[PDB]
Design a protein around this ligand. Structure first.
Ligand SMILES: C=CCNC(=O)[C@H](CCC(N)=O)NC(C)=O
Ligand SMILES: [Cl-]
Length: 130
């Protein structure tokens, strides 16, 4: 219905605002664009499901997220991809891991403070109806 379309539109406006707040934080610059194969040709061979915040915006705009849980799965991928590709004890890998954990924690903290649980439950029930 039109009222369900309006619910998904509100979801996309909420997700674009959360994503923009993460993307303008200087700690998370490395996560704003896909990894360039020039710099990192083994990336695409190790990480099978690359994800970054520009890809998340594109997904929102293609109507790929119908719940905040689905969006958070892609934020969790940005985090777990960085834990898997950069697992060493050296400071460059530790800094990327701590920035990726902090992205994930920040997205979950904004959602805890600003997502109404009844709005998420509504989205979940429309999704499940389809
Ligand atoms: C799992 C997310 C966070 N990762 C971290 O805590 C990183 C260190 C990496 C480690 N030893 O795991 N932060 C630092 C350097 O303090
Ligand atoms: Cl830096």
């Amino acid at each position: 219905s039109m009222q369900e379309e309006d619910t998904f539109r509100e979801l996309r406006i909420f997700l674009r605002n959360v994503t923009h707040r993460l993307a303008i934080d200087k700690r998370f610059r490395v996560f704003t664009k896909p990894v360039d194969p020039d710099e990192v040709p083994d990336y695409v061979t190790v990480i099978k499901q690359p994800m970054d915040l520009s890809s998340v915006i594109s997904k929102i705009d293609l109507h790929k997220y119908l719940t905040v849980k689905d969006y958070l799965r892609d934020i969790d991928l940005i985090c777990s991809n960085a834990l898997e590709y950069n697992p060493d004890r050296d400071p460059g890998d530790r800094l990327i891991r701590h920035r990726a954990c902090a992205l994930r924690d920040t997205a979950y903290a904004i959602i805890k403070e600003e997502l109404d649980e009844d709005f998420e439950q509504l989205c979940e029930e429309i999704q499940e109806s389809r």
